[PDB]
Amino acid sequence: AKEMKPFPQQVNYAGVIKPNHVTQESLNASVRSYYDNWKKKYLKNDLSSLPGGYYVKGEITGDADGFKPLGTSEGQGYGMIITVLMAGYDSNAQKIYDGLFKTARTFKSSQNPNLMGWVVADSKKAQGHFDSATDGDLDIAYSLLLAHKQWGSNGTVNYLKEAQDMITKGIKASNVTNNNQLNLGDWDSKSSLDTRPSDWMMSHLRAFYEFTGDKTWLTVINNLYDVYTQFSNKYSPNTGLISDFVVKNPPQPAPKDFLDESEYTNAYYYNASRVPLRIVMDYAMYGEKRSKVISDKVSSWIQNKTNGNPSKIVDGYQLNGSNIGSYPTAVFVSPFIAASITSSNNQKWVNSGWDWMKNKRERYFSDSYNLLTMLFITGNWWKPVPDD
């Protein structure tokens, strides 16, 4: 046991509530059980093309450039954050983490080699074949800052140095645009105004600043808040929602069928379902008031929309709040609960949301984001700080 931040860190962020109808021990126990199941089902280390490599079993339909996709850099980043946070419960966490990192660097991007290509497939030919996706690299780079604070950077992998390289030579170089947004991946233009708001991981960017000193990250954070408010005052003045993809200046919803991902790229659909967690963590961890304002607006809308019943949330909404989807899944429900933690007036709703999510097992995408959300709202996602 060499963890400096062993699970459970059960931190108490200023101004935020946790579910309070059960004890902290009960919260931690639910997370341990959820991780047991998550790891058994999705954590894999069976790449014949990469002995010792680990990945997260995702769902990609069907082939990608002629390869059978097994996971994505998005899932790689989720699994890497989960692995470092569960270290001290998982006694093999550092071995798994270093195996996840081995995969992330072997399947490097064909464009910027400091990033990961977006597809994991069991072929040497796939290693270095694919371009990157911004959100995968954000989570992966952030996980190396957690790893640096969890195990230190004096062993086999220099986590801090790897993070600084990925952040500066990878994400800054390829994904931070001339307009101080984040583009879609390193295949995209440095001047692109196309963006995916679930990439706007405000609290990650704060950590990038604290561990690099590069004020670029603060100017991007400040710009993205401006973009969020400019978008929502025009296109979601009552719900506070944002679309799966955002284009142009002034920002507006992407067209339907954008990048052929779905008919609902103009709406609050499966990409944007993740946004409320990404935003609210900035209030929780760094005290950003603009994050509370955005989170409270979305939280108050969904609570009224559902009459305080989280099981009435559906999988997709128009920006004016009309239902697209039909059933509750955790990648929608749990971030709506997380968005609600900045006001103590939401305690009963947070408690109800906890009961809905804590044992909710379904598939890779909802389970992984559910576990990240559970870790954050129980206080077990701690802040990496350049202290000592």
| DSSP classification of residue 129 | T
Q: What residue spans of the chain are helical by DSSP H?
A: 24-42, 73-85, 93-106, 134-151, 159-165, 173-175, 202-212, 216-235, 275-286, 289-305, 330-339, 347-357, 364-377
Helix (H, G, I), strand (E, B) or coil at 225: helix
Helix (H, G, I), strand (E, B) or coil at 150: helix
Calpha distance 163→214 (Å, rounded): 13
Contacts of 270 (CB under 8 A, 6+ apart): 244, 262, 315, 316, 331, 365
Report the chain's C-alpha Rg in angstroms.
Answer: 19
**Are the CB atoms for 187 and 132 separated by under 8 Å?**
yes
Between helices 73-85 and 93-106, what is the axis angle to 10°?
A: 160
DSSP 286-330: H--HHHHHHHHHHHHHHHHHTTT-GGG--S-B-TTS-B---S--H
User: Hey, what amino acid is at 386?
Assistant: P
Calpha distance 243→253 (Å, rounded): 6
**Are the CB atoms for 86 and 78 separated by under 8 Å?**
no
How many angstroms separate the first and last alpha carbons of the chain? 19
Look at residues 189, 203, 207, 188 and name the one whose alpha carbon lies nearest to residue 145: 207
Q: What phi and psi values does residue 296 have, to the nearest 5 degrees?
A: -60, -40
12: enclosing H helix or E strand: none
Calpha distance 254→246 (Å, rounded): 5
The 10 Å CB-count burial string (b at 16+, else e) for 149-178 is bbbeeeeebebbebbbebbbebbbebbbbe
Q: Which residues are known to be catalytic?
A: 74, 135
Look at residues 273, 350, 341 and name the one whose alpha carbon lies nearest to residue 11: 341
Calpha distance 365→336 (Å, rounded): 16
Q: What phi and psi values does residue 381 have, to the nearest 5 degrees?
A: -100, 95
